[PDB]
Design a protein around this ligand. Structure first.
Ligand SMILES: Cc1ccc(F)c2cc(C(=O)Nc3cccc(N4CCC(N(C)C)CC4)c3)[nH]c12
Ligand SMILES: C[S@@+](CC[C@H](N)C(=O)[O-])C[C@H]1O[C@@H](n2cnc3c(N)ncnc32)[C@H](O)[C@@H]1O
Ligand SMILES: [Zn+2]
Ligand SMILES: [Zn+2]
Ligand SMILES: [Zn+2]
Length: 237
């Protein structure tokens, strides 16, 4: 049914109005970068490309970049400088995606262009919690009878919670037969998580990933992904 584009989320007044008429998802605080609840050199050796090579369509810090090969982003001090193609998280080089209402899963993401395989979609941003804060929030959310949950594992004692604060990545739904994956990238010595396509995604297709997370509580949510190999429930490892 109703869809919306990512720029629609930049106007909180218009958003709150479209929301009241069921044309946009419920309001949340839109953020650019992870926020830590509790607060807590790496140069590559790529050969600076010439003016000539930039013009032909050559890639600066491409598949042989030693930073890229370790899922580390370069900094502003990269030998390719401005031209470095390995600062996707930092430069918000997100894929062209729209937010759409699904039949039974709530809102979702869909490709607005064809997206090649291994294309960066979006960073999963949110409030970064420790294990204690996370468990507190699970209990609070269960008490409030929330339907949608927004936790993503980042690393030991770091769980991203996009329930209150996040970005449009929070709309990506789980599928047992997905077309995207998470990848954890080191950006300024700190880990972030992003969604990347794992195959060619046709324009108009819903973007999905295989959500993996330790099981908590009782009454696990049912999966409506529609795959022949559906596990039937969301989460688990
Ligand atoms: C980032 C993302 C993408 C797609 C998903 F399906 C999910 C699901 C989650 C998620 O946080 N699930 C999550 C985490 C913690 C507790 C729970 N439970 C949800 C249902 C609760 N019962 C009492 C109804 C029991 C606690 C769910 N996070 C997702
Ligand atoms: C991170 S959110 C995704 C965005 C959410 N659909 C919304 O409307 O805000 C995760 C929640 O979406 C729903 N969801 C995601 N994938 C699903 C699936 N395959 N089947 C059923 N519900 C799903 C569940 O309620 C889950 O807790
Ligand atoms: Zn490089
Ligand atoms: Zn670089
Ligand atoms: Zn499923």
């Amino acid at each position: 049914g109703p869809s919306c584009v990512m720029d629609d989320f930049r106007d909180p007044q218009r958003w709150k109005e479209c929301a009241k008429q069921g044309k946009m998802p419920c309001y949340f605080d839109l953020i650019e970068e992870n926020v830590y609840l509790t607060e807590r050199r790496m140069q590559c050796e790529c050969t600076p490309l010439s003016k000539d090579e930039r013009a032909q369509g050559e890639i600066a810090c491409g598949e042989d970049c030693l930073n890229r090969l370790l899922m580390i982003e370069c900094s502003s001090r990269c030998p390719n400088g401005d031209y470095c193609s390995n600062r996707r998280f930092q430069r918000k080089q997100h894929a062209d995606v729209e937010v759409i209402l699904t039949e039974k899963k709530g809102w979702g993401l869909r490709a607005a262009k064809d997206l090649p395989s291994n294309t960066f979609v979006l960073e999963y941003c949110g409030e970064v919690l420790d294990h204690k804060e996370f468990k507190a929030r699970v209990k609070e959310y269960a008490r409030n009878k929330n339907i949608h949950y927004y936790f993503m594992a980042l690393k030991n004692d770091e769980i991203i919670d996009a329930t209150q604060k996040g970005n449009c990545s929070r709309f990506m739904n789980h599928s047992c037969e997905p077309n995207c994956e998470t990848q954890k990238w080191t950006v300024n010595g700190q880990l972030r998580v992003g969604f990347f396509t794992t195959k060619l995604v046709p324009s108009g297709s819903e973007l999905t990933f295989d959500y993996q997370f330790q099981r908590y509580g009782k009454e696990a949510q049912k999966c409506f992904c529609g795959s022949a190999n559906c596990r039937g429930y969301l989460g688990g490892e």
